[PDB]
Structures are given as C-alpha cells and as structure tokens.
C-alpha cells in the first residue's frame, strides 16, 4: 500500500516551495571569513558539537583524543584520552557538564567533567555507534550501525526504548527543539521521525537516492533537512509528509557529510565531501557564498545555539570558527 | 590579562605539551588493518600474537598495531572509511578453498579500487598453503593453460597471479600489493609484515621528498 501513501502525499502537494518562494528578497552573497582556526589535533577530525554556552565545543579525532576547545579565545580546556582510537560522534549536554563519544567498539562512553575520566559506558549495540545527542543530561539518544537507535539512561545504563524500524545503518539523529521527537537518517535512503515517549516511528520520508550521512531539525521543529551521498540535500516537512526543496546542483559529485541550520533557519550550512562546505538558502533553493577554507574533506559542522558562528571541522585536523 | 585567563592559558599550554608527546609516540606506531574472510586463518595470522580485537606487536623495537573488526555487521561500507590512515591493509586469503576464492578475489577488488582507500597499500597473505599442497597432490577456466614465471607451485602461483592481475588492473604508484605464501605453522609473518611496511613507508617518503 506504499502507492496509496504516495498518492495521498501527492494530493496535498498542491503547491511547490520553489513556486511559492518565487517572490522574496534574496539573501546576498554571504561572506563568511574564517575568524579562528583551532589546531592541535594529531589526525583527522570526525565529529564535534557546540556547547550550550555558545563558546565551548568538543572535538573527537582519529588520534584517540577527545578535546574541548574555547572558540572565543582558542585556549583548550580539556584533552580527554579515548579507550579506543576509532570514534565518530560527539555529544554535549544542555547543562554543558557532560560529554559523550563512541564509534567502533559499540560503546557510548560518557564523561563527567564537572569534577574527567568516565561516568558511564553504554554497551547494548551490536553495531558501530554513529551519532549520540544528549536529551536532558540524564537520557542520551544514541544511533548505531545495527539499524536501530536507542534512548538510554545514565543511571541504569540500559536502553529505555529501542527504535528498531530502520533497514540500513543509522548515521545521524537530531533532537527536536521541544526535546519530544527526533529523526534519524539511515543508510536505506530514508529518514524516520521517532517519538521519545512513545518509542515508535511516526513517519517515514523515503525521498532520497542513497545513504543519508547527516540530518538536522528546522529551528521551529516542524521540518528537517537531510544530507545524502547523492550530493543533494533535501528539506522535509513533518506536517506535509513530503519533500519541499531539493538542494542539488550540477558540478557537485561528492556526497554531503554534514548539515546544520541557522538560528533563523534561513541558511542551510551543509559540509560537503568536495574539500569545501557550502551555504544553501533554506527556502530559496539557491546557493549563497561557499565556505572554502579546508585542504581536506569536511567531516563535521555545527552552528552555535545563539547563531553567532558556524564551525566546520575537517580531515586536515583543523577546526575553523567561521562567521 | 586577568586571574583566571592566565591559568587557562597555562592549562592550554600543558594540554599542548601532552598533545605533542602523544604525537611523538603516535606516528611511531604503524596501525594495521586485518581483513580476511571467515574461513581464512586471519586469526591464525594472529596465532603468532606478541602482546574488535587489537593485537599490538613490535619487531626491531618499532611497534605495529593490528586491528581486526568482527563485531560489526557485514556491511563494511561506512565503518571502513574510519580505516583511512592505516599504514597497510593485511588482506588474508584462504588459498585452499577454490569455491570461496572467487569471493576473496571480489573482496580484494572492492578494497583495491575504493575511493577512500586509494592510497592504502595492501599486504596479501595466501595462508593455508599446506592445505593447498595437500589438495593438489591428492572451477577456474583460466587454469586451462598457464606457465609459472611440482604442480603445487603452478597452483599457488596461479592464485597469486589472479590476485596480482586484480591489483594491477587499476594499479598506480600511490599504493602497491605484496603477495606472500603463508603456512599455518609459519612464524616469520612478522618479518614479512616488517619488510612490507618498511617498503611502504619508504615509498611514502619518496613521494613526499619529490624524488619521483
């Protein structure tokens, strides 16, 4: 009955965002100049996450060191060694006194730096951990490559629920501003909106062509954008249950590896694998100024909570605080 | 410029010192990726263990770190990207099973032509050679005519030639392949890995110095 759902979504597709957005004041060429470039990582970077204080941020690299910066002054604050050299995630607590990581070895190590060694290790997954985002400083939603996310609990250390609905590997999840729902972009070219309390999928947005390496929520919480290996970012609306705008441009063959939204949700800052991140207009489907300052691949991206800066780590072992 | 700021800068400098020490001790260890099918004696190559299942062994006072990933599902298209700075890929192959050998060839072909592993040289171990000898002394249409450049020699060099053809089909100076004929009771595998890794680092240095 998939054709029935396709027809139902077609029926409500009476208007197109590109056509509806035909008459709006365009955003001029965005000139984002590298304000800071944080160096000190032995090897390529894999993930990072801005803190709630809008300045402190964490970065995890291949070298096996989890490092906490201070983007305002660039003065490091912590360099926590890892129990495994392979990590592909980084989590920040809304309180700001907890940090998480993980990857191969299937452990979501969680550090308590409000004394910095370990506070818990979550060992329920049968595949590589991909992305973990702190929920309330006591529950940590966690993806994994065994095709199932999970909502954990620090005190018990065991899954509270399990979102076993996917078919491929889960790559990235983004919590809603309400902290009630979240999504997860899998490798089966889909992205399912889950429910934290109910613990069951509510929608599936099968509108991609290949894996989905990153995902982010709209600031209002009623839409989210996905980044694929088709070199195309798509914007999905929860209410309309269909794709709105596809940010695909010719002469771009490298697949996206990160995506994030601006404070007003106007610019989709998508970090590509073509040596240089891009900036897309959220509601115009047009390319704004490119942010090319990395000599290697871009492996992460994070826009500050207050929107004052956007950091784009890459595989050259350098974090750059653009603005 | 303040009370806490100078302490913060001191902490940053200390962290930088520890990072520099870790960099000094890190580039000296050559991480190795071990990729073999279930039937292949990839654990037997670890049966020579010398101090995911890491096995850290050093030869001539230089450390090699060996990583074999077996706890993950059989969809190694996204967790293999993590193994991009590995010095060499130790591809272990069971040379006895003719039926399963085509799968090993296809796996090696996928490893060789990969976009992200386009700069990783591969050490190829065709172990269980004793089983191969026993089988021949007691599938592929390319064996109809073939001259080695007893019959066990012809068979083993046929398998090696197939692997080498797969390697050189898209071969380039960026990365090379080093075949070997391992036995289940061979203890010299450490020396073979050492010589191969030495040549890999030598070629990396040659590329860096622009002598080529």
């Amino acid at each position, epitope marked *: 009955l*998939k054709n029935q759902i396709r027809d139902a979504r077609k029926a409500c597709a009476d208007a197109t965002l590109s056509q509806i957005t035909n008459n709006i004041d365009p955003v001029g060429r965005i000139q984002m100049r590298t304000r800071r470039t944080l160096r000190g990582h032995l090897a390529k970077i894999y993930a990072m996450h801005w803190g709630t204080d809008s300045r402190l941020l964490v970065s995890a690299s291949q070298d096996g060191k989890l490092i906490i910066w201070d983007s305002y002054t660039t003065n490091k604050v912590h360099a926590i060694p890892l129990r495994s050299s392979w990590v592909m995630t980084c989590a920040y607590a809304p309180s700001g006194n907890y940090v998480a990581c993980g990857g191969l070895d299937n452990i979501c190590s969680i550090y308590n730096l409000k004394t910095v060694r370990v506070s818990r290790e979550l060992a329920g997954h049968t595949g590589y951990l991909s992305c973990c985002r702190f929920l309330d400083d006591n529950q940590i939603v966690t993806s994994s490559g065994d*095709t199932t996310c999970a909502l954990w609990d620090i005190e018990t250390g065991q899954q509270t629920t399990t979102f076993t609905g996917h*078919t*491929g590997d889960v790559m990235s999840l983004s919590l809603a501003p309400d902290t009630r729902l979240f999504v997860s972009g899998a*490798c*089966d*070219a*889909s992205a399912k909106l889950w429910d934290v309390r109910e613990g069951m999928c509510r929608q599936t947005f*099968t*509108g991609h*062509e*290949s*894996d989905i390496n990153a995902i982010c929520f709209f600031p209002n919480g009623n839409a989210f954008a996905t980044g694929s*290996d*088709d*070199a195309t970012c798509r914007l999905f609306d929860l209410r309309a249950d269909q794709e709105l705008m596809t940010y695909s441009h010719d002469n771009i*063959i490298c*697949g996206i590896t990160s995506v994030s939204f601006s404070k007003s949700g106007r610019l989709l800052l998508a970090g590509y694998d073509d040596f240089n991140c891009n900036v897309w207009d959220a509601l115009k489907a047009d390319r704004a100024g490119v942010l090319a300052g990395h000599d290697n691949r871009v492996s992460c991206l994070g826009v500050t909570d207050d929107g004052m800066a956007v950091a784009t780590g890459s595989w050259d072992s350098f974090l750059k605080i653009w603005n | 410029l303040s009370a806490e700021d100078k302490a913060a800068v001191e902490r940053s400098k200390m962290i930088e010192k520890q990072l520099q020490k870790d960099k000094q001790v890190y580039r000296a260890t050559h991480r190795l990726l071990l990729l073999g099918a279930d039937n292949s004696g990839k654990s037997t190559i670890v049966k020579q263990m010398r101090i995911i299942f890491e096995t850290k062994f050093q030869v001539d006072k230089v450390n090699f770190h060996m990583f074999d990933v077996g706890g993950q*599902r*059989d*969809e*190694r*298209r996204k967790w*293999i990207q993590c193994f991009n700075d590995v010095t060499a890929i130790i591809f272990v192959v069971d040379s006895s099973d003719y039926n399963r050998l*085509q*799968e090993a060839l*296809n796996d090696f*072909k*996928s490893i060789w*032509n*990969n*976009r*992200w592993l386009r700069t990783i040289s591969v050490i190829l171990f065709l172990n269980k050679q004793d089983l191969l000898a026993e089988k021949v002394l007691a*599938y*592929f*249409p*390319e064996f109809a005519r073939y001259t080695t450049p007893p019959r066990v020699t012809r068979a083993k060099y046929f398998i090696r030639d197939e692997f080498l053809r797969i390697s050189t089909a898209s071969g380039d100076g960026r990365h090379y392949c080093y075949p070997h004929f391992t036995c289940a009771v061979d203890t010299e595998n450490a020396r073979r890995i050492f010589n191969d890794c030495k040549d890999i680092i030598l070629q990396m240095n040659l590329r860096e110095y622009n002598l080529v």
Partner: nanobody
Amino acid sequence: QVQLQESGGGLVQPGGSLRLSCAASGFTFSNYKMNWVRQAPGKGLEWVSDISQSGASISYTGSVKGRFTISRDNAKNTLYLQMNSLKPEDTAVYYCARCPAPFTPFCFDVTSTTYAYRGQGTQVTV
C-alpha cells in the same frame, strides 16, 4: 524511494537460453554501477556481473565467464542479464543490486546478507 523488481526467470530446461531483466525506479539511472547477484539453497550470496554507469566496463565471476551477457540501457530504467548456457547449479536465485554511491565504482555491500538497494529477487530453477 529505490525499488527494483525483476522478471522472466521462473523455469527453463537446462538446454536453451534465459533472459533476466531488472527494472529500476526512484533514482537517476546513469550514475550508479549495477551488479547482478545470486543466492544458493542454504548458502551465501554470490556475485556474478557488473556494468559501469558509462556503459562499457563489464566485470564477471569466473564460474559464468563466457556464457553470460549483461547489458544496461539508459533513458529506459532497466537492467538485463542474458544467459545462453544454463547449468543445473547456476539456477537458485538471481537478485538485482545497485552500488551504493554514484560517481564512484567502489561497491562493498552489493552482496551483503541484508542490503537496502537490492531487488526483491527473482526465483530461478533448472
């Protein structure tokens, strides 16, 4: 949404020929390398053929080399696998699979036990 279905392989006597066609939908059919794949009764998932997005780069497995033909057509999203020499042990099942990434010949899980861009598979018997 990627969805691949194949038809035209249910049963054929050992002598003769058989034509397999795998239909492609939901994605651009000029950027992805398509492979064919088999299964066996109580065995693993094999690998047979391949063809690049450009049109002319065909790889094969040793067992069926020289008696199987593969062709793909752009502007009409479908795949083909001509089989003009049938042998009893090559007649278990014939899946249809796509290489995960476009503009890239690197395929790793085209024969994984639980793949996402694989067709439902057409039963083949002899």
